[PDB]
Amino acid sequence: TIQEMNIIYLAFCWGDSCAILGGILFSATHAFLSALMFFLVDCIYRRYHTRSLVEVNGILHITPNLGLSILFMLVFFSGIPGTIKFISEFYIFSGLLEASPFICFILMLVANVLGLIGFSKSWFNATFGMPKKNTKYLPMDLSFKESYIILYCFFFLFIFSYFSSIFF
Amino acid sequence: YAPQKVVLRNEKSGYYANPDDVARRLIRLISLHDKVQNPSAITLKSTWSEIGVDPLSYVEIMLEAENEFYIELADEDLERFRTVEDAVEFIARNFFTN
Amino acid sequence: GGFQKYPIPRYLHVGQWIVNKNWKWNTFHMFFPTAILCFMVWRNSMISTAKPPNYGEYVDPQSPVAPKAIKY
């Protein structure tokens, strides 16, 4: 969240230039993505009575829907084409390349490689593995409410790219 | 097809392999050794020293037993073994894929 | 060859050794509607498909289809 908010704020450092459009789109996509990520963390903490990687492992093999949600959340966070996340990244980086190409390269490198790898390491380690500990207390799966919340977040992140381009 | 009713793990018998066959194969392997003199005297309750297996010959026999049975035995388990009975019990109860 | 089969909990919705009795009808009802959907998509997309001229055809430079530069 700190990273995405800082990128959005940087998008507003050129007064009322075209960067505002990318900033607004990135604000929307960050809102939805952060909601998704925090809801996944909430589900993990509520069904597994911990939100620490050392105590949580192999979520997929006991709660396949939750693991799938985690994996698709990681894919969306990676900024795949077809998502408002990718569109906002494209806007911001296209502007920053002409503003200061070396700074744009450093920002892209750091955020989308080092930070992305750090983010993905913990989530992959949690999702994968083998949950041999505390077999009597393992949860069942996501509920309908959680499943539909996740699905709606994904649906918005995907379909908002078709919004009218007049305002973007 | 598995029934829709709940079915629990069925530990039929602790042995994953025919214990009689395991014991006979192990006894044949032991008899193959040069130090071993009388195959008849060998029994599941007979100790390695009394049947004639030296401590150094024991590791050779155990390596060849590993080769024959398609498994690997830890040094801790090999040292813990005290009789052919224990050896055959461990080998038979061992899951070949761990 | 494969690993020995082990029991899977009934309550858990997992794919371990899942075989469906009605797989024939399931495949029938999952294949044809997908084919119809993709036929609709294909016929929609063909409206915006481009192909080069054929073997015996040449593009007239003054024809409307020929590329036209911007007029200031």
Binding site: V54, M130, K132, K133 | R9, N10, E11, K12, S13, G14, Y15, Y16, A17, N18, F95, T97, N98 | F3, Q4, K5, Y6, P7
Partner: peptide, 26 residues
Amino acid sequence: GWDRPDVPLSFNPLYVHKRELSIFDT
């Protein structure tokens, strides 16, 4: 031939922690 018992639960041996997980190795 032999009627093997079900796959043992020892196939996945539970790991017991015996050393502190240093924060410096996060």
